[PDB]
Amino acid sequence: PAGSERDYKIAFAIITALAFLTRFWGISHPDQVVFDEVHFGKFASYYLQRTYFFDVHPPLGKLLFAFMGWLVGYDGHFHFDNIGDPYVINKVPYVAFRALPAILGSLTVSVVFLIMWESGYSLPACILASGLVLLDNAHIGQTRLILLDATLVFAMACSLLCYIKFYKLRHEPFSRKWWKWLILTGFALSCDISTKYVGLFAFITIGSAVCIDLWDLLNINRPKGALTLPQFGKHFAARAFGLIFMPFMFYLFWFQVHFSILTRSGPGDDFMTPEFQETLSDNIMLANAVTIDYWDTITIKHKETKAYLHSHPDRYPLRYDDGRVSSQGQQVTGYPFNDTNNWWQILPAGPFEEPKLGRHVKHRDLVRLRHVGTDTYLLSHDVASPYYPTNQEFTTVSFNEAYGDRAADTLFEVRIEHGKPGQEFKSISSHFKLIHNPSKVAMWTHPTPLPDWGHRQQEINGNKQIAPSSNVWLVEDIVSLPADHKRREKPERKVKTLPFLRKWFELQRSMFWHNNQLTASHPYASLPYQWPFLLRGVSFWTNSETRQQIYFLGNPVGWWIASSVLAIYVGIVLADQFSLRRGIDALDHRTRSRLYNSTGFFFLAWATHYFPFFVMGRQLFLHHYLPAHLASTLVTGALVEFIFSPFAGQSLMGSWIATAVILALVAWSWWFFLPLTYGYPGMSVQQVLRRKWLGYDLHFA
Amino acid sequence: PAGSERDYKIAFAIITALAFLTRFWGISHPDQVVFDEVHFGKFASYYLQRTYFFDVHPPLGKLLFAFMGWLVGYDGHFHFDNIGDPYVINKVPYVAFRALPAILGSLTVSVVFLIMWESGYSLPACILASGLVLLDNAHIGQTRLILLDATLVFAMACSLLCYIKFYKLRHEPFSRKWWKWLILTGFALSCDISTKYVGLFAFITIGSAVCIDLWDLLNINRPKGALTLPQFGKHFAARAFGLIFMPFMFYLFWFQVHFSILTRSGPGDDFMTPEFQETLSDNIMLANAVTIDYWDTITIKHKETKAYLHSHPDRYPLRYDDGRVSSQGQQVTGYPFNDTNNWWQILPAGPFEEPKLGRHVKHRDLVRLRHVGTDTYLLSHDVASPYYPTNQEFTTVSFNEAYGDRAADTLFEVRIEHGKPGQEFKSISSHFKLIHNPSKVAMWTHPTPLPDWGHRQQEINGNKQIAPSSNVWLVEDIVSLPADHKRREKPERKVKTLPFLRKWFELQRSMFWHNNQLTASHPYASLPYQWPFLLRGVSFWTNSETRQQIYFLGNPVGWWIASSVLAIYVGIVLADQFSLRRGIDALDHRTRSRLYNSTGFFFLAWATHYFPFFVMGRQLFLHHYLPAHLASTLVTGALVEFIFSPFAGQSLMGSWIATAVILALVAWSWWFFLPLTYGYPGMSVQQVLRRKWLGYDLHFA
Ligand SMILES: CC/C(C)=C\CC/C(C)=C\CC/C(C)=C\CC/C(C)=C\CC/C(C)=C/CC[C@H](C)CCOP(=O)(O)O[C@@H]1O[C@H](CO)[C@@H](O)[C@H](O)[C@@H]1O
Ligand SMILES: CC/C(C)=C\CC/C(C)=C\CC/C(C)=C\CC/C(C)=C\CC/C(C)=C/CC[C@H](C)CCOP(=O)(O)O[C@@H]1O[C@H](CO)[C@@H](O)[C@H](O)[C@@H]1O
Numbered sequence A, B: 001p002a003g004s005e006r007d008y009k010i011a012f013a014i015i016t017a018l019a020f021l022t023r024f025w026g027i028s029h030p031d032q033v034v035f036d037e038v039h040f041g042k043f044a045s046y047y048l049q050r051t052y053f054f055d056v057h058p059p060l061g062k063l064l065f066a067f068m069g070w071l072v073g074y075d076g077h078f079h080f081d082n083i084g085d086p087y088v089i090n091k092v093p094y095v096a097f098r099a100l101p102a103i104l105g106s107l108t109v110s111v112v113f114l115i116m117w118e119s120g121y122s123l124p125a126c127i128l129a130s131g132l133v134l135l136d137n138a139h140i141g142q143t144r145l146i147l148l149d150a151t152l153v154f155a156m157a158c159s160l161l162c163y164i165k166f167y168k169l170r171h172e173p174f175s176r177k178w179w180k181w182l183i184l185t186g187f188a189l190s191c192d193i194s195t196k197y198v199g200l201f202a203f204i205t206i207g208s209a210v211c212i213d214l215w216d217l218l219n220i221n222r223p224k225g226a227l228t229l230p231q232f233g234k235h236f237a238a239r240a241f242g243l244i245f246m247p248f249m250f251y252l253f254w255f256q257v258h259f260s261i262l263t264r265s266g267p268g269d270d271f272m273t274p275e276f277q278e279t280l281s282d283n284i285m286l287a288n289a290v291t292i293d294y295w296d297t298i299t300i301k302h303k304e305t306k307a308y309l310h311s312h313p314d315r316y317p318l319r320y321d322d323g324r325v326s327s328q329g330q331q332v333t334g335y336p337f338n339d340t341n342n343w344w345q346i347l348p349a350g351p352f353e354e355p356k357l358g359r360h361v362k363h364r365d366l367v368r369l370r371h372v373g374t375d376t377y378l379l380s381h382d383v384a385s386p387y388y389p390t391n392q393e394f395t396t397v398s399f400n401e402a403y404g405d406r407a408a409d410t411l412f413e414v415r416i417e418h419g420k421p422g423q424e425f426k427s428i429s430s431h432f433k434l435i436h437n438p439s440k441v442a443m444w445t446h447p448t449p450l451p452d453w454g455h456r457q458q459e460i461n462g463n464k465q466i467a468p469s470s471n472v473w474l475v476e477d478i479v480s481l482p483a484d485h486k487r488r489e490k491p492e493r494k495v496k497t498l499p500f501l502r503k504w505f506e507l508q509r510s511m512f513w514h515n516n517q518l519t520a521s522h523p524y525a526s527l528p529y530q531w532p533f534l535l536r537g538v539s540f541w542t543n544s545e546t547r548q549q550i551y552f553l554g555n556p557v558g559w560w561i562a563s564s565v566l567a568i569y570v571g572i573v574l575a576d577q578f579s580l581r582r583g584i585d586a587l588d589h590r591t592r593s594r595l596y597n598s599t600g601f602f603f604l605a606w607a608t609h610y611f612p613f614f615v616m617g618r619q620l621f622l623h624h625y626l627p628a629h630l631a632s633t634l635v636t637g638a639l640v641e642f643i644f645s646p647f648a649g650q651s652l653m654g655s656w657i658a659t660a661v662i663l664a665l666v667a668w669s670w671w672f673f674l675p676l677t678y679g680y681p682g683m684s685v686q687q688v689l690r691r692k693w694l695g696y697d698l699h700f701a
């Protein structure tokens, strides 16, 4: 081909278009909560409802997710709870959440091309680096989910580009462009460290690159004049202000935004000292949830179908259509509307006693439920239900039965979701499962209506599995408790204000301490020595019916080539230094400086983003190598311009063929592992075997 | 005072005499097995009876201990078993065992003085370094026990001295003295790495010091002539042969000695492949080994407490003191004596069948255990045990329960320690854990007796953690198998011979793999960042009747001063380099070179023996810093010669006063903590409080 600015622009546009294509293609396919979408989606939602929470990560990533959610208009109440629940059946915009990391990944590929272009390399080198980042399965798989690692990688690449822009302005110090790019480098580093704490490693890179520069600026005998000590002091002050103080100010600003958005009580208030509880303005749910007492009359509403637990005088038919025999007891149903047949009085287990006031119902208490309209008592037993031969019938019985020979079958455990010992059962806020005490079945319902004999109402029966979310109920109203009762009018709510620095210091210390002790084990934790050559990969999500896995791993051909070129660059530097020690140059001035100033800089970044992971001994995963691998993709491109080099660039055909072959091979490797990256096409068992290269636990073999 | 060779010799003799005094004074006081004397004494004894065993450490240290034991003439059979048993009532020479590390510590102090003397420093600097090593409580406390860290420290100091001797001969290359000191440096490094694997760090130090030298030898433009490439090749070959190949040969020789001494079966044969069991003869000491068959009656003995698994008709009480409710089942206990209630019949899982002969029990088989004296079957279930709310109760049940509705809870897996698939379960030699099949709890016991209701016997319960060594049992006797039975006949007994390299490779791989997985938790594990300033110390041995503790920690004043001088040296080097960048020398040629060639070398050693502990993420203790701290004591001395410097050494009075004051203060600090180092004088409670400087867990307050 050829080389010109128009060709550079065409290649950049094509690379950006293909990046946006690959990152966004099939972004909504997993359509389910995946490996770590749980926590970050929870925190983004908590940002949206302004309820306070606690996390060990710096807030900026979750702020970005919450901004994306707020842009659409979603507020909702779908705080994520478990891996493997459908987003689409919950009216939540997960695609909007996932579009931000995809945008950042596409911009990461564009920024890689920009870094190679600005450094002065030829077109094939920029194309090779941008293509290695483009055709990488790990980068694609990380920018697909609700995960804040894509923001980290994008911020590191932006810091590299900003520092390359700034360093080229070293011949015009303290100008407007000079200060602008200094502050921009500081801001990129600030975003990098405000996403995840490992972003500190970028501060090492730009740190080292500054230090060497300062050393060059401190030489009393240097070709480009000499600086008096006050001038070097001005240079050092500028570097410290733009690279240390501004990043800290932006970090503090992000915590200021975090504190200002969160002004309501929520999960995570207890990690703070009581003064902070005094400033979170405990509100909104507080009003809606009142502790339920024995002898209260309540309504019980199914979370998913919105049906109310209901009864009426009609009885189950003697025979069902399949010939089974019922107890012919009073029907218990789910009813969508409000009427008196929804009213149940919650009563103690054990013998009859006259009513008492103020006895709170608590988590895991055994209770009876008396249907007010018929004066009967809820009961389950091992008689098969109307529609489910495996599930227990629910019915009601007389007082004499409930406190006599059938008493045990009238006892139900109130199991509060996420309940703790002694926790009070509250209207609205205590989602719960109602567990039949003899059998441990959970009271359950579903949408398909009963026949006409059951008034086309929902069936109520006993589910043998307790785990399903369809077993969850809530108490909507304490019907018997008047609107003016003291039990509803004792808020005692006052909210004070603390200085920002005090709150920030308390939160920072608590976050550091919890990150120092609150570690949850994961079966796919990796070690730094396994990353550069992809010895093992992590699995995020899988379902067995469609045979679809989303096993996360890099592109083996691309990673192996990048690491091998890292080794080749090490060898080239060693050989050049050894030949120089003998007094042989063997390198042109232009080709030496670049190999030590630009390419070396890239090799610095990789090192500064890889080696510090050996010092840290907590759990680390393969995605932690995503930043460093990025720098690995840069040196590769440089080394293709280097070894195949004859502005002198006549007959780049050698580098053109080199990059064409390497990128075609990496493209074949990316096509091979593409299903494992996306999980859309169900793959056969023998096809799973072909991907078992270096011992990858695909668990579909 | 003054300075002369006679004064140097007098100071050296006095320092050596005081070293031998301090290391040997009260060496036999603890007169009991202490923190890690167990393992190393076990291995030294096994060396003495020539019975094969397995360890993760290189053999040389235990060879030295066994040589010391053999010199006295002790062979005996007192293989150590538990921490806290008296040596004197067992006819064992523990003082002879402990004299070797004491000799090595005294020689370490002498070698420190020799290193400072040979490098060219003045008398006060050598005295200061040797006194800081002399008056150090950690070095004294490490050279007191049966522990192979003193050998490591002595070998590192010897390698430093040997390399300093060798480097001074650089002006007469390839001479007899040159080669002699090269080989001696290699041999010292070989001993260092053949004691403990962390001795590899010394190879880093002498490695780096060589590399710099080679760089200086590679310069084509250097003041002392120029070397052609063949001459530099000869130099590099000499370094590689004396520093890489000879150390490996000595390491291999120590394994050859280890293999030649061990030609009898012993504990640790099962870690090898059956060829190796074939190359070890079938020996007499603890000869017993007979495969256990279903329907045999056996006794089951706890390895650590020696209690027998036991039962009797008495039942658990309905309520424990804390209000918990038991199953009221038959008690299962640990009993120290021999009686028929220790007898259990081992039976198949699955349905009842009439007895069959010759069905061997194998690794990971599921079994039942029938208590012969009560005709009941061992059972565990998720009911909390007498003393441990977290651990499962062990009880027994009827035949009808064990082969009926409770059958699953009667099944236990026999998991042989280091077992392989299909391995036969044998009396005596198969140490095992008994894993409850439903819950995966391990059958466990501990020393604190049950109350009177349990006859003051040991509790048996289900430990949720399987890894602990306290889960290990063994079968002591096949009670049902008569003494004259064919199964007790001993077969073939033929011993083959393997090439040394094959045995070494198998043993090395197995040792590396077990060190990679076989880690036992310790409550006093420390982190590298706590070492240089003594933030926490380890306790070795203590008895409550005499109020004597042997809490192991360094000398706080000496360690703090040494680390502070390390920091001061860093600052001095930084300031000198910064002034040189401005073009200001500020240092004489002689005072510069020393500060970069001798003192810097010492600072190298410290670094190369401290920083590599951050890369390693296994358990580390304070004694691991003993080598590096040694180098810290050297730079200190150098920095006292440096800053107080006016052969020019007129009026050393400044350095004399400096070293006198520092050593007097360190001597006061060593006197303060001396009881905690020795444990001879019982100290009062208020005296224990005075030693609580930086949060030291003395547990006598
Ligand atoms: C185990 C050890 C191994 C294997 C490797 C160790 C790591 C290595 C080798 C190095 C570490 C990193 C190093 C050395 C530096 C990193 C930080 C530094 C110095 C810079 C940051 C990166 C960074 C933005 C570098 C900027 C480079 C830009 C593209 C230069 C622009 O063109 P420009 O006119 O200046 O070129 C030349 O400008 C000359 C002017 O004088 C002129 O004369 C020439 O004609 C020619 O015009
Ligand atoms: C964060 C970084 C910081 C803070 C610190 C970094 C670490 C530093 C500063 C350095 C790292 C270690 C370094 C540089 C070297 C270690 C290994 C080396 C080079 C040697 C091993 C140690 C080692 C046996 C050194 C031997 C030194 C012996 C005592 C020299 C004997 O006297 P000798 O005649 O040679 O002195 C002079 O000999 C000259 C001959 O030319 C002559 O001219 C002078 O008149 C004068 O007679």
Ligand SMILES: CC/C(C)=C\CC/C(C)=C\CC/C(C)=C\CC/C(C)=C\CC/C(C)=C\CC/C(C)=C\CC/C(C)=C/CC[C@H](C)CCOP(=O)(O)O
Residues within 6 Å of the ligand: A056, A057, A193, A196, A197, A198, A199, A200, A203, A204, A206, A207, A208, A210, A211, A239, A240, A243, A244, A247, A248, A249, A251, A515
């Ligand atoms: C004098 C200067 C000289 C010689 C030369 C000029 C050098 C120069 C101009 C620039 C660079 C300077 C250098 C080398 C460092 C400066 C950065 C620094 C130390 C502070 C600035 C960064 C900030 C704005 C905020 C830092 C947040 C704070 C408060 C603490 C974080 C704790 C971290 C980060 C703990 C990392 C482990 C982590 C727990 C793993 C979990 O990991 P994860 O959360 O991902 O799961």
Ligand SMILES: CC/C(C)=C\CC/C(C)=C\CC/C(C)=C\CC/C(C)=C\CC/C(C)=C\CC/C(C)=C\CC/C(C)=C/CC[C@H](C)CCOP(=O)(O)O
Residues within 6 Å of the ligand: B056, B057, B190, B193, B196, B197, B198, B199, B200, B203, B204, B206, B207, B208, B210, B211, B239, B240, B243, B244, B247, B248, B249, B251, B515
């Ligand atoms: C080309 C050369 C150049 C450039 C310049 C010349 C350099 C020169 C002349 C000399 C030095 C060379 C250098 C830098 C290294 C050489 C050492 C080396 C790698 C091998 C030689 C050492 C040996 C004789 C035997 C080594 C035992 C073996 C086989 C493996 C051990 C594994 C280790 C040690 C695992 C360390 C962790 C440990 C598990 C923690 C537990 O700890 P612990 O057991 O205490 O509880």
